[PDB]
């Protein structure tokens with residue numbers, strides 16, 4: 001088991017990931033119930049500047065990026081962990 | 083029936099619905115965003131990319147303004 | 162359909178109620194997923210003084226009362242709605 | 244003066260603001276998103292369609308990119 | 323001075339405090355429970371076992387009824 | 402396996418556990434209370450009356466101090 005932020009995110013996503021999609025400036029990341037804030041916290045700890053911000057509900061996370069291009073780059077980075 | 087459950091819940095919980103771009107902002111009574119979000123998530127609506135719920139406001143994300151209008155219109159039909 | 166706070170609570174509980182139990186000074190009220198705050202809000206709007214306060218998670222509400230006797234009285238009042 | 248409460252709260256909890264398209268992302272101190280969101284919703288500005296708050300991040304949805312800038316600059320005025 | 327931040331926040335958001343047994347129930351303005359909870363957790367007082375915050379209500383769990391009173395009175399000092 | 406899932410999740414998310422009276426206060430990493438709460442709710446533990454989760458703290462309610470100790474000891478066994 002690896003402990004850096006990315007590895008913690010990767011690990012957490014193994015159990016928690018449900019879906020990821022994007023539209024325009026935002027990524028919609030769906031998690032297992034009650035896991036949105038947990039995953040949001042790990043994401044916020046990655047410190048990816050391309051991520052303008054994250055807003056987490058209970059099982060859904062919205063990641064806002066400045067541009068569609070930034071959104072894709074962040075989505076791709078997350079996808080890599082899956 | 084998910085749709086019927088949502089309609090029932092919206093009677094008391096609904097406050098406002100609007101949209102811009104590819105999203106719908108649905109305002110509920112205080113504390114109701116998650117409850118309504120749970121019902122909307124149970125809808126079998128492919129066009130609904132997801133919902134993110136605060137306390138009294140739900141953001142419904144669709145891919146496109148056209149999908150957004152479709153989804154909003156379907157919610158409006160329940161009021 | 163009736164619209165007073167109690168009737169709104171009663172109505173909301175028809176769909177949302179899962180379990181109610183108590184221990185000492187507190188009631189544990191379990192709801193359908195994502196319904197704790199919704200039910201907490203209705204409960205807080207009843208203005209029952211015997212209720213010291215409510216703290217809601219996602220599907221679980223803790224109602225704190227000053228005494229076990231108060232707790233029972235509030236639990237009984239809720240039970241009546243079910 | 245009506246903004247004094249929001250100004251006060253921002254002075255203690257504001258971290259950063261940015262916007263993109265129809266949205267403003269406002270970061271607060273941990274656990275302050277709902278608190279600032281309530282103050283923002285209380286403003287009842289028609290340029291703000293709504294807010295969704297997480298724990299430390301608020302998304303404000305405005306009706307247009309122009310409204311978004313207008314709202315963002317109004318908030319920045321308070322800092 | 324280390325409590326100044328919590329005092330400030332309470333001055334704007336505190337509604338009421340009560341306690342029973344091992345617990346303190348602190349009511350805040352809507353959406354302020356997590357915000358005050360964060361300030362309280364930052365205190366890292368060993369008399370407070372922890373806090374759980376809803377939207378406008380914080381439950382502080384202390385180790386004993388005596389600790390509960392001690393903590394409640396410390397908080398009341400700030401008002 | 403619910404227990405195994407919880408154990409796996411606790412590796413990263415666990416911070417502190419304590420108890421008083423008939424409750425357990427379980428502190429997790431920021432933002433993890435609900436995630437861990439979901440796992441604990443999936444345990445088939447009759448003694449656990451329920452959990453209420455904040456942001457990083459979970460309150461686990463049991464009926465009695467004896468049940469509380471039992472439940473805490475079972476959680477401690479996972480660390």
Ligand SMILES: NC(=[NH2+])NCCC[C@H](N)C(=O)O
Nearest residue numbers: 057058059060119135194195
């Ligand atoms: N258990 C629940 N709260 N379910 C509803 C989730 C609603 C929405 N997807 C959100 O994450 O904010």
Ligand SMILES: NC(=[NH2+])NCCC[C@H](N)C(=O)O
Nearest residue numbers: 136137138139280296352353
């Ligand atoms: N009682 C409250 N938390 N009010 C603030 C709500 C802020 C925002 N509309 C949301 O639903 O996330």
Ligand SMILES: NC(=[NH2+])NCCC[C@H](N)C(=O)O
Nearest residue numbers: 033034218219220221438454
């Ligand atoms: N979808 C979830 N968040 N599930 C976990 C709920 C945890 C706990 N029963 C609470 O209501 O706070």
Ligand SMILES: NC(=[NH2+])NCCC[C@H](N)C(=O)O
Nearest residue numbers: 040056297298299300431432
């Ligand atoms: N302590 C936490 N919950 N941290 C994660 C916050 C995630 C995201 N920025 C939000 O506010 O929803």
Ligand SMILES: NC(=[NH2+])NCCC[C@H](N)C(=O)O
Nearest residue numbers: 112113201217376377378379
């Ligand atoms: N706007 C709301 N969520 N209101 C209900 C609050 C319920 C309860 N007092 C809590 O803080 O958890």
Ligand SMILES: NC(=[NH2+])NCCC[C@H](N)C(=O)O
Nearest residue numbers: 273274359375455456457458
């Ligand atoms: N980032 C935060 N919301 N921090 C405050 C947490 C307050 C309290 N321990 C809870 O979990 O509800």
